[PDB]
Amino acid sequence: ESTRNDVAWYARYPHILEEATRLPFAYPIGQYYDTGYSVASATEWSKYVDTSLTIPGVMCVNFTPTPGESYNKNSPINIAAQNVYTYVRHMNSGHANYEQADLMMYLLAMDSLYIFHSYVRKILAISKLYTPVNKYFPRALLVALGVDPEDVFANQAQWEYFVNMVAYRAGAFAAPASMTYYERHAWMSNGLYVDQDVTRAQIYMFKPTMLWKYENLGTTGTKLVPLMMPKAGDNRKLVDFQVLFNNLVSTMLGDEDFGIMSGDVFKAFGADGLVKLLAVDSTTMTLPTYDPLILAQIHSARAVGAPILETSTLTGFPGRQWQITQNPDVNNGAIIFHPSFGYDGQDHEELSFRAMCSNMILNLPGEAHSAEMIIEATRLATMFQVKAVPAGDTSKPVLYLPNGFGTEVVNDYTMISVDKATPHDLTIHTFFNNILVPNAKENYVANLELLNNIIQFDWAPQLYLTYGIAQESFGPFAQLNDWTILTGETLARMHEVCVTSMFDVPQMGFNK
Amino acid sequence: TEVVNDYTMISVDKATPHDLTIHTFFNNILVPNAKENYVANLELLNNIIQFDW
Amino acid sequence: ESTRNDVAWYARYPHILEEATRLPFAYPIGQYYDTGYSVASATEWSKYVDTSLTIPGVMCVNFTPTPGESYNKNSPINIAAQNVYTYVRHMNSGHANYEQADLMMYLLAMDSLYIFHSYVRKILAISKLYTPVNKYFPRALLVALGVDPEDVFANQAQWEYFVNMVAYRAGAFAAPASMTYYERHAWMSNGLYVDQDVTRAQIYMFKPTMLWKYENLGTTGTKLVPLMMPKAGDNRKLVDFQVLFNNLVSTMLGDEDFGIMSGDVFKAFGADGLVKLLAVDSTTMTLPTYDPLILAQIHSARAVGAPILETSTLTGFPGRQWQITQNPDVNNGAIIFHPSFGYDGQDHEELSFRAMCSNMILNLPGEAHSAEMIIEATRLATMFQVKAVPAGDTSKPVLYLPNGFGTEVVNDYTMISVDKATPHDLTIHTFFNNILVPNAKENYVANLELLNNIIQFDWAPQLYLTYGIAQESFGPFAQLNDWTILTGETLARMHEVCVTSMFDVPQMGFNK
């Protein structure tokens, strides 16, 4: 109120002001809204007049749990493995039939079980959320997690008791509760997050793209291979999730080394020092919360692309499948996770991943920034460093090696919105931070619609838009507040700090 | 009461996987005429001048 | 003293310890020292036994005074020009026959006069320094400044009265004392700086490579062209410095616009608000001091190469001569100083300037770093950003455009040492931070001798060494303590802060 005092006509005629400005302001999001025409003769311009209004509701961040780029014995996961093997095997009198990396790959396989339990209990808790002001609940959230929303309705008791039996069978193995790795992955994948703390707010979720399936070799070693989770249009019933859990714990319950290591972690950390997955009942409902740290790391999130499988065909890159391996003959018996990024799921080059080869912008709210805020805002950020070298003469995709990544990486994002054409059903759009717009007339208004749906989300990921007609990318499509240019070594140092913090156990005698 | 035989400097490799490097040297150092010796000897001299005394 | 208590034989036999360890430790630096042979028969190995010991004494930093990369009206020098013209012309009732850039180029031409007076009074004050413990005084310092050391001895009264008459004739023009630009350039170029604060210490100096000579055009505008100062082997007498001062102030004392602007600055800032060059007498001696800020900026100093003159021949780069120009028709009447770097004085490519194309390392003493320490340590640092585009088909040199530079740039360094061969006279070595070592047997022990002379200096500039036999450069040859990788935008922000601070006048009403 700089120099405006009042009009003072509105004060002595407040009734005329009242019935002149009586408007409905609370439109329920979840449905299509037609604005109508101002000029009624404008129906002769069919598409030149836009009367459509579609607010999006859900953006699901699709992530992969990682140990954090181990390529030698001086890795954070290998130092954590040495600490946990010293505490379990030597500080407590543990068994001698396994090694320091067997314990850590067991403890990494336990996190996939905990993420799976958090995922199915989010599926269960979502299906009881119904609101008049939000018509996206719960079908858009259930579609974004990849389930059939009618199967969770018609089989609610079977779903709940499956969640409880998953938490009960997870007690057969032991993992320490003071690892904040498990606590962070549980806190991320259990939770609905609003973007600006209003009534008709937009919802952020975290769904696993894949989990790590424990594969036992002979004397060759021990692997962790991807187990793919359902994507946002799959309509998977309870039987599919039961199959996923059964081949997740198949090689774990019959393994004798896992039984020995489970008993060792149990007697080393006690019974109250272990991770407990708490049981839900019929009145357990999750609610959407407001967390400005979650939004801070969603805003500075850089997608790395699809996981590379053993069945994935990549010309010029034969052996680049994502796996956490361990061979005592290779690399001094170190845990090795060194993945190539930039894969989009096809045997060609995603041409827009070139736009992710400039230094990122770490944008933050406010004007004062805590150290914990900066270390939390960079958790989903992953910068590329170098091209992966192709074997042979020709190679269709372009793979990237990073300079460190955090305790999880983002694969892509999935946005759920309503359609602008009839019957105005839900629309599922999956995208990375880089978006290619090919030279075709049907892609421009589609990309502009996707851009306007993205800017509805408050701390949205920053986008990079490559136009194939121009051979040109545009940089970070976001509103910046208080930002800094971040190079690869700074982000690498922050990633090293967080991965060392996530795999630390304060239950141990290490620096009492 | 003791003589020095050698020194052994432990640094990190600048090529991947960036494992440790073992360099054993006397006070005296020969640099024979090859291109792979001058920059390596310069790296070793810069590694040695990081150590104060 | 961790676990060593004593020997206790040295306590009850202290006399045997006394005459067993009676050694001379204070060798005067400035002369050659022969160690001798341990194995007396080793004269059969002529050069395979090194018995020479030469400590260097002087490293002179050869600098250019700059306004700091003006290429548009939003430059720091143009904002300073607008402020000083607002204060002199409008806040005080000043004359209307000049513009905002005429004042600032007048005030930039005054700094060359002040640097010249500081330079000749350093020459005068050095010649009375004689020490038994340092035989480099004063001949090595006088040689490094480019004078004949016998001419300053035999003509000491003429030299002193020339310094005093320079300070007296500089009073005909007026410049404000509260510009810290003049104070910084005077404090740098008046002073001998020791490297570690000992008796037989190494000396750092600052000599101007060139000064800015005011050239008056017609209605085309106003220029500042280089006036080259003598280099370290020139043996210039008093008559050469009198010629340099006379063509420095030639176009300044007869110019009517300079008289009007001098009277305007005089009546705007008063008489006590002006820069006064204080008069010296026969008992004025400078002494070497210890300044850890000077060493902090010498350590993080990056040379930019030779100045480009109008007579300098550069194939493919016809109009790249260094000049501070101003045309009211060009670029909205802005001061323009946009120089190309990487020139070595010849019409070929200095091949080692490629080694200065990686990000610099800002190294600092201690473990805690003040903001003023970081802003002072980066003053002589200048990083390249892009190659200058060559005109035509072929071009022999490779020129560089920076991303900002401070209030002065370093051109090269000159080290003075004694020769290892007879008659062990003074040797003058001029070098940038990048040093090329060509494939020839006479260059390897020469480069190793230059490296060992450089590491005698405590906060020496970091070197980059290109070997022509290997097609390979090695990075920063220095001992690092507490360092950071610095990119171009961070150094640009620091340069902008310092140039805005250097050209600020607190005598004005600007933010009372």
DSSP string computed for A56-77: --EEEEEEEE----B-STTSHH
* B45 contacts chain C (CB < 8 A): yes
Q: Give the distance, in angstroms, between the CA of residue C345 and the centroid of all CA atoms in the same chain.
A: 18
CA dist list (Å): A415 to A22, A207, A456, C50 = 34, 12, 11, 74
Task: Report the DSSP pairing between strands A434-437 and A463-467.
Answer: parallel
Instruction: Kindly report the nearest CA distance between residue A125 and chain C, in angstroms.
Output: 48
* B46 contacts chain C (CB < 8 A): yes
* C479 contacts chain B (CB < 8 A): yes
Size of the B and C interface in Cβ pairs below 8 Å: 33
CA angle B27-B29-B31, nearest 5°?
A: 170
Chains that touch B (3 or more CB pairs under 8 A): A, C
* B14 contacts chain C (CB < 8 A): no
| 8 Å CB contact between C325 and C108 | no
* Chain C residue at shortest CA distance from A487: C487
Peptide bond into A14 cis (omega under 30): no
Residue A77 token pair: 């996961």
Chain A residues with beta carbon closer than 8 angstroms to that of B19: 72-73
3-state secondary structure C303-357: ECECCCCCCCCCCCCCCCCCCEECCCCCHHHCCEECCCECECCCCCCCHHHHHHH
| Beta carbons of B39 and C470 less than 8 Å apart | yes
Rg of the Cα atoms in chain C: 25
Which residue, among C364, C193, C207, has the nearest Cα to C294 in the 3D structure? C193
Chain B residues with beta carbon closer than 8 angstroms to that of C478: 46, 49
| Beta carbons of B45 and C470 less than 8 Å apart | no
Chains that touch A (3 or more CB pairs under 8 A): B, C
Q: What is the spatial distance between Cα A129 and Cα A127, in angstroms, rounded to a whole number?
A: 6
Q: What is the spatial distance between Cα A234 and Cα C5, in angstroms, rounded to a whole number?
A: 77
Chain C residues with beta carbon closer than 8 angstroms to that of B52: 479
Query: Pick from B31, B36, B42: which is nearest to C465 by CB?
Result: B42
Instruction: Kindly report the nearest CA distance between residue B7 and chain A, in angstroms.
Output: 24
| 8 Å CB contact between C225 and C325 | no
Q: What is the spatial distance between Cα A401 and Cα A386, in angstroms, rounded to a whole number?
A: 5
| Beta carbons of B45 and C479 less than 8 Å apart | no
Query: Pick from C467, C469, C479: which is nearest to B49 by CB?
Result: C479
* C484 contacts chain A (CB < 8 A): no
Top residue of B11, B13, B16 to mutate, by most chain A CBs within 10 Å, is B16
Q: What is the spatial distance between Cα C395 and Cα C314, in angstroms, rounded to a whole number?
A: 8
Which residue, among A222, A185, A237, has the nearest Cα to A502 in the 3D structure? A185
Question: Where does A291-339 have alpha helices with state H?
Answer: 292-299
| DSSP-assigned beta bridge partners for residue C408 | C65
Q: What is the spatial distance between Cα A436 and Cα A443, in angstroms, rounded to a whole number?
A: 10
Chains that touch C (3 or more CB pairs under 8 A): A, B
Top residue of A403, A483, A487, A491 to mutate, by most chain C CBs within 10 Å, is A487
Instruction: Kindly report the nearest CA distance between residue A359 and chain C, in angstroms.
Output: 12
* Chain A residue at shortest CA distance from C490: A485
Structure determined via: cryo-EM
Which strands sit side by side in the sheet containing C58-65, from one edge to the other? C288-289, C192-194, C203-208, C58-65, C408-418, C426-431
Residue A172: partners with Cβ closer than 8 Å, 6 or more residues away:
A253, A262
| Beta carbons of A489 and C489 less than 8 Å apart | no
| Beta carbons of C467 and B38 less than 8 Å apart | yes
Residue A202 phi/psi, 5-degree rounding, is: -85, 150
Residue A88 token pair: 């379990």
Q: What is the spatial distance between Cα A494 and Cα A379, in angstroms, rounded to a whole number?
A: 8
Chain A residues with beta carbon closer than 8 angstroms to that of B16: 71
Instruction: Kindly report the nearest CA distance between residue B21 and chain C, in angstroms.
Output: 18
Residue A408 token pair: 């999880």
Instruction: Kindly report the nearest CA distance between residue B32 and chain C, in angstroms.
Output: 12
Residue C145: partners with Cβ closer than 8 Å, 6 or more residues away:
C60, C119, C122, C123, C126, C205, C207, C230, C232
Peptide bond into C14 cis (omega under 30): no
| DSSP-assigned beta bridge partners for residue B12 | B20
Instruction: Kindly report the nearest CA distance between residue A487 and chain C, in angstroms.
Output: 9
Top residue of B12, B13, B19, B21 to mutate, by most chain A CBs within 10 Å, is B19
Residue A2: partners with Cβ closer than 8 Å, 6 or more residues away:
none
Q: What is the residue type of C504?
A: D
Alpha-carbon dihedral A350, A355, A358, A363, rounded to 10 degrees: -120
List A residues 312-341 in contact with B (Cβ-Cβ < 8 A): 331
Instruction: Kindly report the nearest CA distance between residue C477 and chain B, in angstroms.
Output: 6
List C residues 453-472 in contact with B (Cβ-Cβ < 8 A): 455, 465, 467, 469-472
| DSSP-assigned beta bridge partners for residue C463 | C477
Q: What is the spatial distance between Cα A494 and Cα A193, in angstroms, rounded to a whole number?
A: 24
CA dist list (Å): B6 to A97, A377, B9, B26, C49 = 40, 49, 10, 5, 20
| 8 Å CB contact between C301 and C381 | yes
* C487 contacts chain A (CB < 8 A): yes
* Chain A residue at shortest CA distance from C488: A485
Residue C37 token pair: 């042979």
Residue A472 token pair: 């040109």
DSSP class of residue A355 equals G
Residue C249 token pair: 């102030």
* B35 contacts chain C (CB < 8 A): yes
Top residue of B30, B42, B44 to mutate, by most chain C CBs within 10 Å, is B42
CA dist list (Å): C274 to C96, C107, C117 = 22, 12, 16
* B19 contacts chain A (CB < 8 A): yes
| Beta carbons of B31 and C479 less than 8 Å apart | no
Residue C190 token pair: 């008046």
